[PDB]
Design a protein around this ligand. Structure first.
Ligand SMILES: *[C@@H]1O[C@H](CO)[C@@H](O)[C@H](O)[C@H]1NC(C)=O
Length: 155
């Protein structure tokens, strides 16, 4: 993994560890989340997409990757990788787990804490001032809640 790739991978590991341990503010802790494994095919497809330097593109070809049945995707148009990661994460401020409802945009946060997601790979390209960052996830998420809650005492 590149420098950026490794940082994006660890930031996702850390978010998922945090949500299991009451460390995402105002969000119930998660009972279980599959461990993410990096996947080279997701990462390369992410990278071919990000090299176009088009944020909206999307393009259902970008969602057909090897044999995966379902692919989710988070996109960021941002001057730094860490800023992008933090922007996706803090969408947790908009998300109500009990009602499964969102005020504004929750899609990036929900995909990061999606309990059945197993494979991740991410790709980014410098496109002028900013990066286009593409993360692909397998399986992708749905409109449901991201995980099963567990009692905050188990933290
Ligand atoms: C993920 O969450 C769903 C409920 O939203 C739960 O029924 C399912 O068993 C969970 N699966 C895993 C692998 O954690």
């Amino acid at each position: 993994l590149s420098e950026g790739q490794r940082a994006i991978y660890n930031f996702h590991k850390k978010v998922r560890k945090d949500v299991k341990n009451c460390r995402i503010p105002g969000q119930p802790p998660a009972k279980n989340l599959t461990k993410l494994k990096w996947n080279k095919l997701l990462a390369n497809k992410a990278k071919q997409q990000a090299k176009r330097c088009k944020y909206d593109s999307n393009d259902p070809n970008d969602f057909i990757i090897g044999d995966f049945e379902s692919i989710g995707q988070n996109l960021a148009d941002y001057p730094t990788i860490e800023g992008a990661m933090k922007d996706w994460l803090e969408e947790y401020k908009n998300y109500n787990f009990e009602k499964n409802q969102c005020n504004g945009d929750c899609k990036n946060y929900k995909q990061m804490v999606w309990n059945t997601t197993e494979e991740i790979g991410c790709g980014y390209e410098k496109c002028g001032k900013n990066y286009l960052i593409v993360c692909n996830y397998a399986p992708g998420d749905s409109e449901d809640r991201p995980y099963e809650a567990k009692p905050e005492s188990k933290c």
